[PDB]
C-alpha cells in the first residue's frame, strides 16, 4: 500500500486520466504545490499544504489561490497538458502567493491582497512559458525563475510606501554585527535544518519544515537527505562568514542551499558519489551566493528569495566536465533520483 | 491622394531609389524619427518632428542631430542598406538625443550637450548591430534596447554631480504618498492618454501627444487605437496601485504600455481578437513592470525609460501557445497591422 | 636567443610535453598569470609576478595561490588539458586573489584571507567552464567574466561590515568634485599610462605597470602599443567627463580601456587600420562604460573592476559589419596579433 504513494504516483495519474475534470484539476493543483521541492506527488502536496496551514493558514490560502489561478491561466493560454498535469505551471505561483503573503506589511487576512496575488499569478505561466522556450534549447530547467521575476516585479512596484499593498522594509546592513560565540546553541543549530527546509516556502516553524521533509521523503528518500544536507551546509556557510546567529536559526541561510542540493543531488544529474560531492559543493556555493545577493538586493530594497538557487544550479548544470561519472540527466528522463540512477546505469552499460 | 501617404509609403521609396542621395538621406532620417512608434512613414516623421518642436525646439534639434549621426555612423560601419533606408538605425539615437535633452540639468540650448549626444549616437548602431545579431536568431526584434542601454550608460557615467553634463536627480520614494481621491479629475485623466502617447519621446504636452497620435494614424489606424488603449491601460494600472495623480497626469504611466500595445496589437503578432486581448494584457503587465523598474532604478539613480516595454514585449513574444489564432509574425513580413492581418489570413487559408 | 621567448613560446611547450609534471604545472601557472593581458608566455608570467612583488608581495602571494588552486581544481574537474596548459583556467583566479587582497580592509599578510581566496578560486573553473559552454557557441571568448562574477559574489557576501573578512567601503559620489584645471600635471598624466596598464592587476605603482608593459612587449609589441594607447584613451575619456584628477592619476580610468584595446587591437580581430580605429573607439567606449558601471555599482557597494571591458568587448565582437576588412578571428586561430595578421592575409588571398 505504501508503494502506491511513493514517487511520482504514475498509477494515480493513469487512473485519473479517465475521471471527471474537477478531480484532475485538484490533482494538478496538489502536484503544483509539491513541485516547489521537485516532487510530483499529490499526497506530498497535501502534506505541504498541511505544513503551510500549521505555519499560517493565510499563507496556505494565498498559495493555493495562486496555484489555482496559474493553472487556470495556463489552460487558458493553451499550454502543454503534460506540463500542467505534472504541476509545472503552478509551483511558481504557489511560491508567489505564499511569499506575497510573507512579505506583506498589512496584516494577516488582508483580503485585498488576493487581488495582486491573482494578478501576479496569471503572469507566472507567461514567464514559465518564455523562459522554458529560452532554456529548453540548452536542456536546462526553469527552476524558480518565474517566481523570482514576478516577486521582484511586485515588490519593486509596491515597495514599503505603497498606500494599498505595502511591503516589508528590507534595510541593508549598516553596522558590524556583535556575535557572542559563547552563546551558540547546538539545539538551535539542529533545528535550523528543518527550518531551513521550511523556508523554501517562507515558513520558519520547525514543524512545518519537518512536514516538508516528510513530504519529500514520501516521494524519494534521497531528496529528503539532500534537502537536510543542503540546509546543514547553509548553516556551515553562515557560520563561516560570521552571520548573525538569529539569521541562521531562522533558516535564512539554508533554503537556497537545500534546493540546490535537491536539484544537483540526483534530480537533474545522475546520482554518483562524484555527483553527490559536487552537489554539496553546489549547496555551499549557493549559500554564499545567497548571502551575496541578499546584501546586493537589500541595496535596492528587495529580498533575494530564490535567485541564488536558480543561478547557482544553472551555473553548475551548464558547466561541462570530461568525467563520464558526472552525468547531466536529459530533461525528458528526470523523474526522481532513484529512477534517474537506474536510467544512468542502463545508459552506462550500453 | 491620401493613399500615397498611408502605410510604409513604398511608392515614395521606389521613386527615391533613383534620386540624389541627399533626398534619400532626408527620407531615411524622417523614417528613423517615425520608427520610434513602429511607423515607417517619412510624413509621420515630419509630424513627429512638428510635435517635438511644439513641445521643445531644443529637444527636436537634439533628436534630429542624434538621428543624423546614427545614420551616418551606420553607413560608415557598412550595415545593411535595407535597414538604414527603413530608419531602423536612427530611431534609437532619436530617443537618445531627445531624452538626453530631457534628463539634462543644465538648461535649454546648452550647446555643449551636443557633444555627448553625438558621442552617444555613434554607439546606437553598434548596439543595434550586436543586439540584432543576438536576437534575429530567435526571430525577435530589437525594440528600444540600444537606446535604453546607451541612456543608462550615459546617465550612470555623468550622474547629477558631473561638472560638465549633470543629470536630473532621480530620488527613490521615501514617504507614503498622500492621495486625495476626491480630487481626481476626469478631464486630466482623459488628457493623460495623449500625454501618455507623447511621453514615448519624453514630451508632456497634450498637443504633442495628439500630433504623435495623428502621425501614427496616418500610417495605420489600428496602431493609433492600440497606442490610445495602451495609454488608458497604463492610467488604469496607475490607479490600481494608488500612484500619485501627478504621475498619471504627466503620462509617466502610459508610454511603456502604449508602446507594448502597439507592438503586440497587430505589429509583431497578427491581429485577432485573441491577440488584441493579449495585447491589452501585455500593456497592463508593461505598466506594472514600468512602475517596478522605475522604483528599482531610482535606487541606482536612473530612469527606467523604456526598459519595461522592451522586456515585457520580448517576454510576450518568446512565450509560446498551442493556439493557432495567436500568431507571431515573421520578422521579414512585419509592415503594419492591416497588411499583417492579410498575410496571416492568407497563411491560415493555406 | 630572443626568438625563443617571443610570442606564445610554442617550442618550450613542445619540449615540456615530455618532462616531469611539476615543471609542466609551473609553466601552466606562469601562463595563467600572463593570460590576464592575453599573453601565453611563461616568461611574461615571471615578469608580471616580479611586478606584483614590486607593488605588494602579499598581492603576488595571494594571486599565485589563487592560480595554483584554480589549476588544480580544473585538473580535478576533468577539463580540457589544452586550455589548462595554455593558462586559460588560472588567470581569472589570479585576478580573484590579487583583487581580494586589494579590496580587503584588514591589513597586509592577513593570513586568514587565504581561506576565502582558495574558496573563491575553486569557483573560477566552474564559471570558466559554464560561460565557455555558453559563449563558444557564438565563437565568443570568456574574457574576465568568471573573475568579475566571483569577485562580485565575494564582495557582496562579505561587505564592509563582515567580522571576518571586511571589504573596503565603496561610497557613491554625493558632492560635485572641485577640479582645478590649472593644477593638471603633464608628468602625472604621462605616468597615468603605465599606471593604467598596471591597474589591470589592481596595482598603482608606475614601475609595476612598466614591468607589465615589458612583459606584454616580450610576447607581441602590438599588444604593448595597444595597451598604452588604451590607457591614454582612458585618460582622455576621464578628462572629457571632468573626472577627479586623482582618479585619472591612479589609473582607475585606463585599465578597462587598455584591456579592450588589447583585445580588439589584433587579438580577437585581425589587425587592419580599420580594426585599429575601431579598437580605439572600443577603448573610449570601454572607459565611458567603466565610469558608468563604477557609479552604478557604487550604489550597491561594489567595484566595477573589469565588467566594463568584458561587456564592451563582447558588444564590439558580436556587432557585425559588411566590411571585409573588419575580420573577427576564429577562436581556434587566435594566438597574437602578428600571427593573426598573417592568417588573415592568407585567408584574404584565398
The experimental method is cryo-EM
Number of Cα atoms under 13 Å in the Cβ half of residue B73: 25
Q: Is B324 on the interface with A (CB under 8 A)?
A: no
CA distance B348 to B325: 9
**Beta-carbon contacts of residue A237 (< 8 Å; ≥ 6 apart):** A253, A257, A284, A287, A288, A291
C79 with A322: Cβ contact below 8 A = yes
Q: Is C245 on the interface with B (CB under 8 A)?
A: no
Residue B96 contacts residue B120 (beta carbons within 8 Å): yes
Neighbours of A12 (CB within 10 A): 16
**Beta-carbon contacts of residue B193 (< 8 Å; ≥ 6 apart):** B209, B228, B231, B232, B235, B254
Q: Is B342 helix (H, G, I), strand (E, B) or coil?
A: helix
Residue C170 contacts residue C298 (beta carbons within 8 Å): yes
Residue A154 contacts residue A99 (beta carbons within 8 Å): no
DSSP states of A330-344 as a string? Answer: PTTS-S-HHHHHHHH
Domains observed in chain B? 1-159 (1.10.3430.10), 182-350 (1.10.3430.10)
Cα-Cα-Cα-Cα dihedral sign, residues C328, C331, C335, C339: negative
Please report which residue ranges of chain B form alpha helices under DSSP H: 10-16, 21-34, 42-55, 57-76, 81-85, 91-102, 114-135, 145-158, 186-198, 206-219, 221-240, 245-249, 256-262, 273-298, 307-318, 337-349
CA nearest to B293 within chain A: A156
Per-residue CA distances from B190 to B257, C170, C242 (Å): 16, 46, 45
**3-state SS track over A167-219:** ECCCCCCCCCCCCCHHHCCHHHHHHHHHHHHHHHHCCCCHHHHHHHHHHHHHH
Grid cell at residue B32: 528613423
CA nearest to C137 within chain B: B134
Rounded to the nearest angstrom, the minimum Cα separation between A163 and chain C is: 27
Using a CB-CB cut-off of 8 Å, the residues of chain A touching B310 are: none
Q: What angle do CA C260, C262, C263 make, to 5 degrees?
A: 65
For C279, list phi and psi in degrees, rounded to 5. -70, -40
Chain discontinuities in chain B, listed by preceding residue (C to N exceeding 2.5 Å) = none
Using a CB-CB cut-off of 8 Å, the residues of chain B touching C318 are: 129-130, 133-134
Neighbours of B210 (CB within 10 A): 18
For A104, list phi and psi in degrees, rounded to 5. -90, 140
A323 with C152: Cβ contact below 8 A = no
Which DSSP state fits B173? P
Residue A216 contacts residue A7 (beta carbons within 8 Å): no
Considering only CA atoms, which of C15, C38, C13 is closest in space to residue C265? Answer: C38
Grid cell at residue A149: 521575476
Residue B103 contacts residue B148 (beta carbons within 8 Å): no
Chains A & C: contacts with CB separation below 8 Å: 77
Grid cell at residue B277: 486581448
Classify A242 in phi/psi space as left (phi over 0), alpha (psi -120 to 50) or beta: left
List, in sequence order, every residue forming a beta bridge with B167; answer none if it has no partner.
B104
CA distance B238 to B284: 10
CA distance C100 to C98: 5
For A241, list phi and psi in degrees, rounded to 5. -100, 15
Select from B172, B281, B321 the Cβ nearest to the Cβ of A79: B321
Rounded to the nearest angstrom, the minimum Cα separation between A320 and chain C is: 6
Grid cell at residue C316: 564590439
Please report which residue ranges of chain A form alpha helices under DSSP H: 10-16, 21-34, 42-55, 57-76, 81-85, 91-102, 114-135, 145-158, 186-198, 206-219, 221-240, 245-249, 255-262, 273-298, 307-318, 337-349
CA distance A51 to A105: 22
**Beta-carbon contacts of residue A86 (< 8 Å; ≥ 6 apart):** A31, A35, A40
Per-residue CA distances from C5 to A237, C36, C48, C216, C262 (Å): 45, 18, 15, 12, 20
Residue A227 contacts residue A282 (beta carbons within 8 Å): no
CA distance B41 to B45: 6
A322 with C130: Cβ contact below 8 A = no
Neighbours of C183 (CB within 10 A): 8
Give how far the C-alpha of residue C195 lies from the chain's centroid of Cα atoms, to the nearest Å. Answer: 14
For C166, list phi and psi in degrees, rounded to 5. -65, 150
Q: Is C299 on the interface with B (CB under 8 A)?
A: yes
CA distance B170 to C204: 34
Using a CB-CB cut-off of 8 Å, the residues of chain A touching C78 are: 321-323, 326
Per-residue CA distances from B218 to B11, B55, B270 (Å): 15, 20, 20
Neighbours of B93 (CB within 10 A): 34
**3-state SS track over chain C:** CHHHCCCCCHHHHHHHCCCCHHHHHHHHHHHHHHHHHCCCCHHHHHHHHHHHHHHCHHHHHHHHHHHHHHHHHHHHCCCCHHHHHCCCCCHHHHHHHHHHHHCECCCCCCHHHHHHHHHHHHHHHHHHHHHHHHHHHHCCCCCCHHHHHHHHHHHHHHCCCCCCCCECCCCCCCCCCCCCHHHCCHHHHHHHHHHHHHHHHCCCCHHHHHHHHHHHHHHCHHHHHHHHHHHHHHHHHHHHCCCCHHHHHCCCCCCHHHHHHHHHHHHCECCCHHHHHHHHHHHHHHHHHHHHHHHHHHCCCCCCCCHHHHHHHHHHHHCCCCCCCCCECCCCCCCCHHHHHHHHHHHHHC
CA distance C41 to C48: 11
Give, to the nearest 10 degrees, the angle between helix A307-318 and helix A273-298. Answer: 140
CA nearest to B125 within chain C: C319
Q: For the CA atoms of chain C, what is the radius of gyration?
A: 19
Classify C303 in phi/psi space as left (phi over 0), alpha (psi -120 to 50) or beta: beta
A289 with C134: Cβ contact below 8 A = no
Q: Is A23 helix (H, G, I), strand (E, B) or coil?
A: helix
B159 with C173: Cβ contact below 8 A = yes
Grid cell at residue A347: 545508459
Neighbours of C41 (CB within 10 A): 27
| Residues within 8 A of B (CB atoms), A 129-158 only | 129-130, 133-134, 152-154, 156-158
A242 with C166: Cβ contact below 8 A = no
Burial C124-155, CB ≥16 within 10 A → b, else e:
bbbbbbbbbebbeeeebbbbbbbbbbbbbbbb
How many residues are present in chain B?
350
Amino acid at each position: 500500500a505504501l508503494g502506491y504513494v511513493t514517487g511520482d504516483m504514475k498509477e494515480l495519474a493513469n487512473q485519473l486520466k479517465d475521471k471527471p475534470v474537477v478531480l484532475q484539476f485538484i490533482d494538478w493543483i496538489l502536484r503544483g504545490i509539491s513541485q516547489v521541492v521537485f516532487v510530483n506527488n499529490p499526497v506530498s502536496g497535501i502534506l505541504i499544504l498541511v505544513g503551510l496551514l500549521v505555519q499560517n493558514p493565510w499563507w496556505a490560502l494565498t498559495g493555493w489561490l495562486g496555484t489555482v489561478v496559474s493553472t487556470l491561466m495556463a489552460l487558458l493560454l493553451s499550454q502543454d497538458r503534460s506540463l500542467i498535469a505534472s504541476g509545472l505551471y503552478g509551483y511558481n505561483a504557489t511560491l508567489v502567493g505564499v511569499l506575497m503573503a510573507v512579505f506583506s506589511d498589512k496584516g494577516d487576512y488582508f483580503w485585498w491582497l488576493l487581488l495582486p496575488v491573482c494578478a501576479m499569478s496569471m503572469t507566472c505561466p507567461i514567464f514559465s512559458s518564455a523562459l522554458n522556450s529560452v532554456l529548453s534549447k540548452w536542456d536546462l530547467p526553469v527552476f524558480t525563475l518565474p517566481f523570482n521575476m514576478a516577486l521582484s516585479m511586485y515588490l519593486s512596484a509596491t515597495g514599503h510606501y505603497n498606500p494599498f499593498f505595502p511591503a516589508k522594509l528590507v534595510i541593508p546592513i549598516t553596522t558590524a554585527p556583535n556575535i557572542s560565540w559563547s552563546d551558540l546553541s547546538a539545539l538551535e543549530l539542529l533545528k535550523s535544518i528543518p527550518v531551513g527546509v521550511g523556508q523554501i516556502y517562507g515558513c520558519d516553524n520547525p514543524w512545518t519544515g519537518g512536514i516538508f521533509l516528510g513530504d519529500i521523503l514520501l516521494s524519494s528518500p534521497l531528496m529528503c537527505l539532500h534537502a537536510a544536507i543542503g540546509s546543514l551546509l547553509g548553516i556551515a556557510a553562515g557560520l563561516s562568514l560570521s552571520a548573525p546567529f538569529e539569521n541562521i536559526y531562522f533558516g535564512l541561510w539554508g533554503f537556497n542551499s537545500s534546493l540546490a542540493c535537491i536539484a544537483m543531488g540526483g534530480m537533474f544529474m545522475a546520482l554518483t558519489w562524484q555527483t553527490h560531492l559536487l552537489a554539496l559543493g553546489c549547496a555551499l556555493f549557493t549559500a554564499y551566493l545567497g548571502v551575496g545577493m541578499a546584501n546586493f538586493m537589500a541595496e535596492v530594497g528587495l529580498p533575494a528569495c530564490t535567485w541564488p538557487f536558480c543561478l547557482a544550479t544553472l551555473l553548475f548544470l551548464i558547466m561541462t566536465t570530461k568525467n563520464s561519472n558526472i552525468y547531466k540527466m536529459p530533461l525528458s528522463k528526470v523523474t526522481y533520483p532513484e529512477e534517474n540512477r537506474i536510467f544512468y546505469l542502463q545508459a552506462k552499460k550500453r
